[PDB]
Design a binder for these strands. Structure first.
Ligand code: MG
Ligand code: MG
Ligand code: MG
Ligand code: MG
Ligand code: MG
Ligand code: MG
Ligand code: MG
Ligand code: MG
Ligand code: MG
Ligand code: MG
Ligand code: MG
Ligand code: MG
Ligand code: MG
Ligand code: MG
Ligand code: MG
Ligand code: MG
Ligand code: MG
Ligand code: MG
Ligand code: MG
Ligand code: MG
Ligand code: MG
Ligand code: MG
Ligand code: MG
Ligand code: MG
Ligand code: MG
Ligand code: MG
Ligand code: MG
Ligand code: MG
Ligand code: MG
Ligand code: MG
Ligand code: MG
Ligand code: MG
Ligand code: MG
Ligand code: MG
Ligand code: MG
Ligand code: MG
Ligand code: MG
Ligand code: MG
Ligand code: MG
Ligand code: MG
Ligand code: MG
Lengths: 14, 95, 166, 148, 140, 190, 103, 81, 97
RNA sequence: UCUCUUACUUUUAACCAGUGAAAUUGACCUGCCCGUGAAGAGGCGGGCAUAACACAGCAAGACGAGAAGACCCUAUGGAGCU
RNA sequence: ACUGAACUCCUCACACCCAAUUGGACCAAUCUAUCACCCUAUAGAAGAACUAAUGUUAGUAUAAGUAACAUGAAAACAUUCU
RNA sequence: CCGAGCCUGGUGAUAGCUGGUUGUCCAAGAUAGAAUCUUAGUUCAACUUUAAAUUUGCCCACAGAACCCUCUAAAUCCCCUU
RNA sequence: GCUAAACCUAGCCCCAAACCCACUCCACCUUACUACCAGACAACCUUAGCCAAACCAUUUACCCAAAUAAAGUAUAGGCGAUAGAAAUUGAAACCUGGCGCAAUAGAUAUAGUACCGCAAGGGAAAGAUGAAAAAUUAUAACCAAGCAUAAUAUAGCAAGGACUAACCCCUAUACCUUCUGCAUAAUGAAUUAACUAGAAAUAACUUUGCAAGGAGAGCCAAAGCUAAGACCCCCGAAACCAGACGA
């Protein structure tokens, strides 16, 4: 199948 | 086997053991032979006689049944006309 | 945070006995939180490390690096304070004993790589530390000659014992 | 805990399970060994030599009628109304070397014990107690504090 | 956090003080220092056998050198010194070869004499004197 | 230890706020598998085997054993020259420094446990004198205990207290089985 | 480890055995506590065996300070300026006697 | 913070040792240190080399002239007889 | 770095406190008070554990039995889940079955 | 397109100045041949080689990096469909 | 004939070289009772010990000063030019 | 990021499967099989560990353990002394 | 010597006791925070499933009377995993604490804020002088990794034996897990600091007490009974169900 993993954004305060 | 019950926090007993076995106060368990009332027409009189016997259990089986039953079933009973009264004690046993 | 280089000019020595070496003057100076990389600053400090004050200023005047003018400014203030505060009569009679760069407090920013992925950017800062000693620069150590090589080889041969015995 | 498996991971099958084969405690046919166990009557045995010992050690006094409450107050028998004990049964263990001359009231008695007690000039009678009266006569003081 | 560890530094230093003379990150970083110190201590324990063996090999080499200086061979010298009932070990034999060359020459001469006497004995079955530096001394 | 109740408690990985969802699905990225924040492996997560609720440490030694301990402590106090028996605790003045000077002059010790009877016949003089002292502790006979007798250097009883203690500790010997609690009539038991 | 530790050669102090043997131990200083469970072995050592030790070897000066301490100690000072300090904390009297004889 | 006192005391002792190593004080006389009894030291000295010295003669041999001049200078500068 | 650079403030303990000096008093009150009171009745604490030791599952079951009707909603949900989990753990998991 | 490729321009490139990531990383003082060995070695055996240190390239190896193989099997693990 | 083990002898000492599993002797920190009083003791207890979980968080490295990214020209800085 | 959305809750779902499981020191310690939707697991045997009670355990000699055809081997069982 | 390091106290936890809150003016169910207009619609309902039964298909504790005991007994049940009473018993009015945490801990909390999401919803991080800062003084340093002071020297798991000498000589196939067996080119790991994983019964064993009786009612008892000690982990699916939120 079409296995995709969306990217993860870190919290903006760091 | 419900070591701790959700109501009292107590150990429970397996009732199949109680329905199938008798415990003498000495520590011995008495059972009946398997198949002692199944297809007696294909069995010899000696086989049926040895199937009609009340027999003792292993050490391993005895400890398993003691674990599966509660200490209420291990107390000393004083029934009126118990046919197993004389078997509740051991005599002339050395270590 | 530690600021100990600043307090090295507050040391007061007891008065020397008349018959004693001059005890040349010793001046410490620094600049904190320079918007520059500490490796890039280390290269300029390493160049300046052994020179006299005038030669170091001359070398830093014609270097086209961002930290060259910063180190030049630091050296100029160090020279001025050496003549004014620490009793150095000849403004040209100073040489650089210590010249080094150190990491400063930095910041972190986001880099926005070419997907929903990213990196962390660091806004680099650095410190510059200089130390001036009054007097002419010490002569450079001459390379050892073949005579010295032979002498040390002979001494190595003569130093050997009979090992693992009486 | 050993290496992996159900052992180290703690997810071991229940006690009595034997790996899938019909267990031992299920293979055996059912038999009515303990069929009506909670309804059978029980009687604490009281031997003639124990009664003689009680008499000799300053405990329950033959000069007065001896019944369940006297035996419990002398602490010769401990009767449990719960656990289905219906009183004291008299047994002939110390039939000989028994010189007591007592008037005792029990719930069961063997003919040899009756002979032994009647033989020393005493009288033995056999009475009945329901569980409630058993509790009352064994511990009268709590019944009196009960207020009934 | 009831009773967490307080003196972890002293355990880290207990391991790290045996790594100060190492090279790389294993002289300061515990995770690598501990492994390298374990190996170093195992090597220290195992090195005693090798030290004994290597010192004996050095003695044998030195004795061979001295015996060849005197024209003898090491097996001949050792065997005939045993046969003369002089029980000097390889250590003291090398000691004498380095520091008492006169004594070592005397020892080599005695071994050569005993070897020649052994050859004469293998030729003549004694008959009469069976050699002079033969005739072992008996004890009871 | 029998009266101790420990009120220390932690939150397990189910009582910590949040953590219901699974972050960063199982197989995609190159991160370790996790099914919840607030797991014990996480900062801010639950405690795996921390203290749980108020815990009680209640148990009872047999009262024969405890009475034996009382007799043993009295025996030790007598054998080590630490027991003093008075006719009555009475002071002409009724001030703490008098009692302290008396103890110092009599070479009793630093901590003195004075024992009286019934807590009501305690005289005003000793009550006033001892209510200010720190190492001088006035207790009735009913409160005598091994911990206090060991904590105080010297034990100071009275004659009625001696008789009371003798009777109460001797009753434990030559006593029957309970057969029901001793707060019930028990004809000869007061 | 030898490669991780210093080393020296076998030697004497002042050619001890050539003329007269001299006791290299100069002083023993004891810190022992009046009260304190850790100084009980030291307490009984001072009670019994310190006097006999001093009488046995009179070239050694022994001081006992008797100060409040959690760790009783013995400091041995030698003719060549060497100072060695040992803990006699929670040690038996035989242990302390063996320690001082070794010192 | 972490509750406790033993690790803190140990680290304070370690820091004091490191400070002493980094800045060693100038050495002083053994007579200026706690454990010192001069008469006992003299007797033990005489006893250790297996000799029978005259005690007063040994004290005289250990006195020095410069010491005497320093002492008299100290007394004359302090005004004490 | 983990150790404090300073010594923690000296913590003085008053051993002759009121509480420390009176600790243990009126214990043995049943033994030498004609058994009018039990020492277990000198215990102060939660209503569901006074004179009772119990397990952790036993403690949870007892607390829900005795005081679980006037508990807060989230606390009671937590107790129910804890009892469920503890039942499963003490009845299905571990060595020694 | 190719036989069969060549020339120039722009970008890139390389150097100088400013700013300044990411995957990756057990530690590394990180050579070749033959042999060996969990069966394909920089690290083991036997030989050979061998002052130190930047810069630009290349892609033969580091069973190179990435994604706890999707192919195959197993699980008294699932789910969609008939 | 010699060399050659941790085999055996020699001087001294000896509990001091198997996975899972099992028995045992001690024991670091902390808190509590009572001691102690430059950091200890006898006991009771427990959130009681981390070279490793593509572990969690924070710091800082490596890759790397690398990949990458900017400002059309002259001048009076009015303006003009491409 | 749809063979069936997403969020919260049941939920610390369950995992015979992988990974991990933290002071010192000493000691004993390697298993014939049976059954099982069972062979990636478990239960009973067997081996192993601890503590107790008691008396024999191992090694073994004579004598002894159908036949049947054609051989019938290395050996085995039993077994006092020692 | 830089970066750094270190610190007590904000607060919190578990109990006890006590039943607790809410209109200054104005605005706020329409597109909430909107001064002012004619269809008046309206709520009341058995959870399910995961899981256990080593599959699963009947079944599988979880409900709101102080305790205790009867009793894990009677009973129920693919009579099997497990489920499980009652009669009866009896349950002394008052006392403001901590062998709890101390900034990765203790509440998510400095805050349900910032930030993320259309929405339901998810959800942070962090502070440290001193009596005085209307004392800006000079001190106070010492301590992780990373660097600098101070690049390098034939050869080789980085060391050990050593040695007069750092190297040169000789010896030596990282660790963990997993396996019949790994230097293995099988797993994992840049490194530092902090956090991070064995919870309990039956029956035995040892040590006390008392002893044909023990136990502070109930229970056990042909030396037993009472009390104590000692004892059974952590992370991870794809799933299923209920109720909301989304064109
Ligand atoms: Mg494992
Ligand atoms: Mg297996
Ligand atoms: Mg939750
Ligand atoms: Mg990764
Ligand atoms: Mg999960
Ligand atoms: Mg937390
Ligand atoms: Mg550039
Ligand atoms: Mg090859
Ligand atoms: Mg290159
Ligand atoms: Mg490699
Ligand atoms: Mg690959
Ligand atoms: Mg995989
Ligand atoms: Mg299967
Ligand atoms: Mg040899
Ligand atoms: Mg914990
Ligand atoms: Mg822990
Ligand atoms: Mg760590
Ligand atoms: Mg880790
Ligand atoms: Mg590059
Ligand atoms: Mg470029
Ligand atoms: Mg799990
Ligand atoms: Mg694997
Ligand atoms: Mg062994
Ligand atoms: Mg089947
Ligand atoms: Mg399997
Ligand atoms: Mg199932
Ligand atoms: Mg299962
Ligand atoms: Mg299935
Ligand atoms: Mg009822
Ligand atoms: Mg917090
Ligand atoms: Mg938080
Ligand atoms: Mg450092
Ligand atoms: Mg080499
Ligand atoms: Mg394999
Ligand atoms: Mg191998
Ligand atoms: Mg590997
Ligand atoms: Mg694998
Ligand atoms: Mg990796
Ligand atoms: Mg399923
Ligand atoms: Mg479905
Ligand atoms: Mg639309």
């Amino acid at each position: 199948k079409k296995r995709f993993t969306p990217p993860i954004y870190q919290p903006k305060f760091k | 086997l419900t070591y701790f019950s959700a109501r009292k926090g107590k150990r429970k007993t397996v009732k199949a053991v109680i329905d199938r076995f008798l415990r003498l106060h000495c520590g011995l368990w008495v059972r009946r032979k398997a198949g002692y009332k199944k297809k007696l027409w294909k069995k010899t009189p000696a086989r049926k006689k040895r199937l009609r016997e009340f027999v003792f259990c292993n050490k391993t089986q005895s400890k398993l049944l003691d674990k599966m039953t509660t200490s209420f079933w291990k107390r000393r009973n004083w029934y009126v006309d118990d046919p197993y009264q004389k078997y509740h004690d051991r005599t002339n046993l050395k270590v | 945070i530690s600021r100990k280089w600043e307090k090295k000019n507050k040391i007061v020595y007891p008065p020397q006995l008349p018959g004693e070496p001059r005890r040349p003057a010793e001046i410490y100076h620094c600049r904190r939180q320079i918007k520059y990389s500490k490796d890039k600053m280390w290269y300029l400090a390493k160049l300046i490390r052994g020179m006299s004050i005038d030669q170091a200023l001359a070398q830093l005047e014609f270097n086209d690096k961002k930290g060259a003018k910063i180190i030049k400014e630091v050296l100029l203030e160090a020279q001025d304070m050496a003549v004014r505060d620490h009793n150095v009569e000849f403004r040209s009679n100073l040489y650089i004993a210590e010249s080094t760069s150190g990491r400063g407090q930095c910041l972190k920013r986001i880099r926005y790589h070419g997907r929903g992925r990213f990196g962390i950017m660091e806004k680099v800062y650095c410190h510059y530390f200089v130390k001036l000693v009054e007097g002419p620069p010490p002569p450079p150590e001459p390379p050892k000659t073949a005579v010295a090589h032979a002498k040390e080889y002979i001494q190595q041969l003569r130093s050997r014992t009979i090992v693992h015995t009486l | 805990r050993g290496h992996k498996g159900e052992r180290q991971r703690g997810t071991r099958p229940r006690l009595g399970f034997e790996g899938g084969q019909t267990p031992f405690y299920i293979r055996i046919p059912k038999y009515g060994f303990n069929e009506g166990h909670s309804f059978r009557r029980q009687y604490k045995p009281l031997s003639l030599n124990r009664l003689q010992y009680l008499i000799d050690l300053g405990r329950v006094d033959p000069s007065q009628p001896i019944d369940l409450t006297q035996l419990v107050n002398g602490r010769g028998v401990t009767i449990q109304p719960l656990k289905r004990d219906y009183g004291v049964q008299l047994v002939e263990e110390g039939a000989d070397t028994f010189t007591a001359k007592v008037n005792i009231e029990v719930q069961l008695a063997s003919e040899l014990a009756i002979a032994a007690i009647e033989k020393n000039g005493g009288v033995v009678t056999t009475a009945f107690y329901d569980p409630r009266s058993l509790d009352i006569v064994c511990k009268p003081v709590p019944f009196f504090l009960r207020g009934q | 956090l009831r009773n967490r560890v307080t003196d972890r530094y002293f355990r880290i230093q207990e391991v790290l003080k045996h790594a100060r003379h190492f090279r790389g990150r294993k002289n300061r970083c515990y995770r690598l220092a501990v492994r390298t110190v374990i190996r170093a201590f195992v090597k220290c324990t195992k090195a005693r056998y090798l030290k004994k063996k290597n010192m004996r090999t050095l003695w044998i080499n030195r004795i061979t050198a001295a015996s060849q200086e005197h024209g003898l061979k090491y097996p001949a010298l050792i065997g005939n010194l045993v046969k003369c009932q002089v029980e000097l070990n390889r250590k003291v034999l090398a000691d004498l070869a380095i520091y008492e060359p006169k004594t070592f020459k005397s020892l080599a001469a005695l071994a050569s004499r005993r070897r020649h006497e052994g050859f004469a004995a293998a030729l003549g079955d004694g008959k009469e004197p069976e050699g002079i530096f033969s005739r072992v001394v008996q004890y009871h | 230890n029998f009266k101790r109740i420990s009120y220390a408690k932690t939150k397990t990985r189910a009582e910590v706020r949040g953590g219901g969802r699974k972050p960063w699905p199982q197989k995609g990225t190159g991160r370790a598998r996790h099914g919840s924040i607030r797991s014990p492996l996480w900062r801010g997560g639950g405690v795996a085997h921390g203290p749980r609720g108020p815990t009680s440490y209640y148990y009872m030694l047999p009262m024969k054993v405890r009475a034996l301990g009382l007799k043993v402590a009295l025996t030790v106090k007598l054998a080590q020259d630490d027991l003093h028996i008075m006719d009555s605790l009475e002071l002409p003045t009724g001030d703490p420094q008098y009692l302290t000077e008396l103890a110092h002059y009599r070479r009793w010790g630093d901590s003195v446990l004075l024992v009286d009877l019934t807590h009501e016949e305690m005289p005003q003089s000793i009550v006033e004198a001892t209510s200010r002292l720190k190492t001088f502790n006035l207790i009735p006979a009913v409160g005598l205990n091994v911990h206090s007798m060991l904590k105080h250097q010297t034990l100071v009883l009275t004659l009625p207290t001696v008789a009371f203690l003798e009777d109460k500790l001797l009753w434990q010997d030559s006593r029957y089985r309970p057969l029901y609690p001793f707060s019930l009539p028990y004809s000869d038991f007061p | 480890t030898a490669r991780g530790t210093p080393s020296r050669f076998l030697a004497s102090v002042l050619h001890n055995g050539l003329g007269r043997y001299v006791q290299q131990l100069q002083r023993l200083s004891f810190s022992v506590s009046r009260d304190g469970a850790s100084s009980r072995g030291a307490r009984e050592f001072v009670e019994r065996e310190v006097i006999d030790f001093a009488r046995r070897n009179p070239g050694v000066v022994i001081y006992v300070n008797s100060r409040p301490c959690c760790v009783p100690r013995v400091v041995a000072e030698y003719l060549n300026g060497a100072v060695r300090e040992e803990s006699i904390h929670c040690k038996s009297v035989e242990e302390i006697s063996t320690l001082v004889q070794k010192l | 913070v972490k509750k406790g006192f033993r690790a803190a005391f140990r680290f304070q002792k370690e820091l004091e040792r490191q400070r002493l190593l980094r800045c060693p004080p100038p050495p002083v006389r053994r007579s200026e240190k706690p454990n010192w009894d001069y008469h006992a030291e003299i007797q033990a000295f005489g006893h250790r080399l297996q000799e029978n010295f005259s005690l007063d003669l040994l004290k005289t041999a250990f006195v020095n002239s410069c010491y005497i001049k320093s002492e008299e200078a100290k007394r004359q500068q302090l005004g004490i007889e | 770095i983990g150790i404090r650079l300073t010594l923690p403030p000296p913590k003085v303990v008053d051993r002759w406190n009121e509480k420390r000096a009176m600790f243990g008093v009126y214990d043995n009150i049943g033994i030498l008070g004609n058994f009018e009171k039990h020492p277990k009745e000198l215990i102060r604490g939660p209503i569901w554990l006074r004179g009772w030791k119990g397990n952790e599952l036993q403690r949870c079951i007892r607390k829900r039995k005795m005081v679980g009707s006037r508990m807060f909603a989230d606390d009671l949900h937590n107790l129910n889940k804890r009892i469920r989990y503890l039942y499963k753990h003490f009845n299905r998991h571990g060595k020694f079955r």
